[PDB]
Amino acid sequence: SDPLLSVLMWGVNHSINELSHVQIPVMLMPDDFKAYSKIKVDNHLFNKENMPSHFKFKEYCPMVFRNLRERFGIDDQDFQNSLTRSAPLPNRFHTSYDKRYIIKTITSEDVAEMHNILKKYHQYIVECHGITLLPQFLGMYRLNVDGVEIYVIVTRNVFSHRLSVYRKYDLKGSTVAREASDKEKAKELPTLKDNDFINEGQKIYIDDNNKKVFLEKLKKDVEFLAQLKLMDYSLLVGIHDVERAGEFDPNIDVYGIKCHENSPRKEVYFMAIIDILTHVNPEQYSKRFLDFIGHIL
Amino acid sequence: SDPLLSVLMWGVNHSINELSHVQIPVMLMPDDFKAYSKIKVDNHLFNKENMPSHFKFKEYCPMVFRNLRERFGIDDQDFQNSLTRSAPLPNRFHTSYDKRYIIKTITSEDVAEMHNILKKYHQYIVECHGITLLPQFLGMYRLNVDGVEIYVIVTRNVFSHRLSVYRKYDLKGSTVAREASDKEKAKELPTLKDNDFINEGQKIYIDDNNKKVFLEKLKKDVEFLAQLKLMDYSLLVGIHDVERAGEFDPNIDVYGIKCHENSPRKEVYFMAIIDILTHVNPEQYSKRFLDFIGHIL
Ligand SMILES: CC(C)CCN1c2nc(Nc3cc(F)c(O)c(F)c3)ncc2N(C)C(=O)[C@H]1C
Ligand SMILES: CC(C)CCN1c2nc(Nc3cc(F)c(O)c(F)c3)ncc2N(C)C(=O)[C@H]1C
């Protein structure tokens, strides 16, 4: 009874069904990056209980996002199920009922930026064999329900689908002060920021190897982002306390890192980059971002 | 690679999938008779191998035809399979790959006439509990593929889906002479007419009970048709010779009648009304049709 949501589920369902009939080659062609499919639905005096009467669904570059899903080790049928077997839950983003995917509303500006970087982004994912801390983009759509038009993007959840998170940080490593809201603090899991970290002595206990890998990854990802003139992105950090609610599937919870053996508490960390689509400058912003994360880890 | 056909299969598939999610009540409402659903599809640089790039599919009164299918003992999933698991074959009509259904192209005039009689037709099917020799109408659609627009209707095949037919008649019982074509005679199974019957001494060997039932049915059906100002319909007659290519399923081959015990050859007969949608007069045409069939049976 959120009509936009049901158009989305209807849309995702339809999309994966269509693709199931398409022969998938190993390569994308340049045209695949300029492609889309539109479906306009008009129901007159029919099917009122489920669908809206007049709606639209547009999918951008279905072949590119098909290719990306598989490269991120996501199967189309599983993806469909996660988005359609039961509604996504709100909170401003939605998360799939099974906590695997994030569904964020974006602007037409963002859609244009995505289209602008999609080839280079795709090529990046090829080179690093899908091993990255960048947002994993899984699908991009336009929804129309009688007058209202929204754009959405789908990504992999940085947090675990099983193991709960008792503390979140959103780090940018900026010179201007960043601190969390008192209004947000009241919510079950607040969204702490650079100084809630730098102030309240938060430590991330990972071993020297896990840290070396992570920072090497982070370095390449961030340089790629700067080179695209992208900035204002964050590192999302999630802490799972084993001794409250802790063995994860690193093939589903791909962003997990176990704490080292001498850690004060049994912890799992979930860390990746989020919010890349905004296009003082990009170049130094990345270095300033990389300096910060080095210091806190 | 007949694009209109693939739009039809695509369309039928989509339609039954949508309906599978609709809660079906025991009754139709008046609005159900005025209802439709349109789907417009635009593929830009995508999915070229299967679907056309720009197509439309409109289904008339989906709830009415859903109700009719079930009343004719056809399950939606089976119906979908018959129309979609493999292409329909031509010959001007198409027949489903499994020989269960006929797909005929009709005019917008015919579609308007169907809409005009649909409530009364439906009510008729309720009263006779679906036991009739009338065309069983299972679905009605509009297809658009880049410029061309066709209307189709789907019916149950009068002939058997298993047992072959070596002789067909098309009887109207008209005063003006009717005889088959020499050009058609050359084809494997010609389409004989009133005088090919009345001339070449053709007999239909059914027992006095089967004949009584049939004619009683035929009487009600035909009166109903006349009362709707419909005429120019025919009795399609199909003879299966057991001793050439004969036990049928009367729940799939619903129009079958076994020959009586003293019949010169082991025969099965398939007889029903076809071609009702044309709107010297209707009233006597029916009586003249009923006179004829009485005499030949
Ligand atoms: C709200 C903002 C700051 C985060 C939005 N965001 C993401 N969010 C999550 N999971 C997530 C889960 C939570 F339980 C939660 O409280 C939270 F804050 C975030 N995964 C991936 C992304 N990716 C890749 C992103 O680009 C953007 C879209
Ligand atoms: C071509 C004309 C005269 C028949 C078309 N027709 C039907 N045809 C068939 N099966 C059929 C099968 C054959 F193998 C065949 O050679 C043939 F002639 C007809 N069943 C039901 C209908 N119904 C109900 C009809 O209203 C109309 C649409």
User: What is the DSSP secondary-structure string of A88-127?
Assistant: PB---EEE-TTSSEEEEEE-HHHHHHHHHHHHHHHHHHHH
Q: Give the β-pairing of B101-106 and B36-44.
A: unpaired
Closest alpha carbon to B180 in A206, A285, B189, B294: B189
Closest alpha carbon to B226 in B177, B281, B175, B174: B281
Q: Tokens representing A76?
A: 């189309």
Q: Tokens representing B54?
A: 């720009």
The response to whether residue B69 sits with its C-beta less than 6 Å from ligand 2 reads no
The response to whether residue A106 sits with its C-beta less than 6 Å from ligand 1 reads no
Q: In which residue are the tokens 């299967």 written?
A: B50
- Measured distance CA(B277)–CA(B153) in Å, rounded: 11
Residue B44 φ then ψ, to 5°: -105, 120
- Among all residues of A, which ones are annotated catalytic? 104, 232
Name residues whose C-beta falls within 8 Å of residue B63's C-beta, 6 or more positions apart in sequence: A46, B22, B28, B32, B35
- Cβ pair B36:A21 closer than 8 A: no
What's this structure's resolution in Å? 2.7
CA distance A92 to chain B (A): 30
**Which chain B positions have a beta carbon within 8 Å of A37's beta carbon?**
41-44, 46-47
Q: In which residue are the tokens 């309240």 written?
A: A200
Q: A23: nearest CA in chain B? A: B49
* Residue B167 DSSP SS3: strand
The response to whether residue B274 sits with its C-beta less than 6 Å from ligand 2 reads yes
DSSP label of B24: P
The response to whether residue A170 sits with its C-beta less than 6 Å from ligand 1 reads yes
Q: Which ligand is nearest to the CA of A114?
A: 1
The response to whether residue A178 sits with its C-beta less than 6 Å from ligand 1 reads no
Among candidates A23, A37, A47 on the partner chain, residue whose Cβ is nearest the Cβ of B42: A37
Beta carbon pairs, A and B, within 8 Å: 72
Q: Give the β-pairing of A36-44 and A167-171.
A: unpaired
| Ligand 2 midpoint to CA B49 (Å) | 32
Mutate to test the pocket of ligand 2, among B158, B166, B194, B276 (most ligand atoms within 8 A of CB): B158
Q: Does A110 touch chain B (CB under 8 A)?
A: no
Q: In which residue are the tokens 């920021």 written?
A: A193
Q: Does A30 touch chain B (CB under 8 A)?
A: no
Residue B259 φ then ψ, to 5°: -75, 155
Nearest CA to ligand 1 atom 6: A274
Name the method of structure determination.
Answer: X-ray
Closest alpha carbon to B290 in B208, B237, B235, B239: B235
Q: Is the dihedral of CA A131, A134, A136, A141 positive or negative?
A: negative
Most A CBs within 10 A among B43, B49, B60, hence the mutation to make, goes to B43
- Measured distance CA(A184)–CA(A186) in Å, rounded: 5
Q: Tokens representing A293?
A: 């994360």
How far does Cα A95 stand from its chain's mean position?
10
- Cβ pair A44:B34 closer than 8 A: yes
- Measured distance CA(A56)–CA(B275) in Å, rounded: 38
Among candidates A34, A37, A45 on the partner chain, residue whose Cβ is nearest the Cβ of B35: A45
Instruction: Let me know: does A138 contact A74? Beta carbons within 8 Å.
Output: yes
Mutate to test the pocket of ligand 1, among A96, A98, A100, A158 (most ligand atoms within 8 A of CB): A158
CA distance B271 to chain A (A): 36
- Measured distance CA(A165)–CA(A193) in Å, rounded: 16
Q: Give the β-pairing of B93-95 and B101-106.
A: antiparallel
Instruction: Let me know: does B165 contact B239? Beta carbons within 8 Å.
Output: yes
| DSSP bridge pairs for B253 | none
- Measured distance CA(B170)–CA(A13) in Å, rounded: 47
**Which chain A positions have a beta carbon within 8 Å of B39's beta carbon?**
39-42
Q: Where are the alpha helices (DSSP H) in chain B?
A: 3-21, 62-71, 76-84, 108-127, 182-185, 194-199, 208-227, 282-296
**Which chain A positions have a beta carbon within 8 Å of B52's beta carbon?**
none
Any catalytic annotation for residue B104? yes
Q: State the number of CA atoms in the 13 A half-sphere of B105 facing the CB.
A: 11
Name residues whose C-beta falls within 8 Å of residue B9's C-beta, 6 or more positions apart in sequence: B83, B84, B87, B88
> How is domain B3-156 classified at the CATH fold level?
Phosphatidylinositol Phosphate Kinase II Beta (3.30.800)
Angle at alpha carbon of residue B249, lines to B247 and B251, rounded to 5°: 160
Cα B111 to Cα B55, B105, B139: the distances in Å are 20, 10, 11
Residue A264 φ then ψ, to 5°: -55, -40
Name residues whose C-beta falls within 8 Å of residue A188's C-beta, 6 or more positions apart in sequence: none
The secondary structure element, H or E, covering residue A42 is: strand A36-44
Instruction: Let me know: does B149 contact B142? Beta carbons within 8 Å.
Output: yes
The response to whether residue A58 sits with its C-beta less than 6 Å from ligand 1 reads no
The response to whether residue B178 sits with its C-beta less than 6 Å from ligand 2 reads no
Among candidates B32, B39, B47 on the partner chain, residue whose Cβ is nearest the Cβ of A41: B39
- Cβ pair A43:B37 closer than 8 A: yes
- Cβ pair B62:A46 closer than 8 A: yes
CA distance B86 to chain A (A): 14
**Which chain B positions have a beta carbon within 8 Å of A49's beta carbon?**
22-23
Q: Which ligand is nearest to the CA of B72?
A: 2
Q: Which ligand is nearest to the CA of A237?
A: 1
- Measured distance CA(B215)–CA(B223) in Å, rounded: 12
Mutate to test the pocket of ligand 1, among A98, A155, A163, A167 (most ligand atoms within 8 A of CB): A155
The response to whether residue B240 sits with its C-beta less than 6 Å from ligand 2 reads no
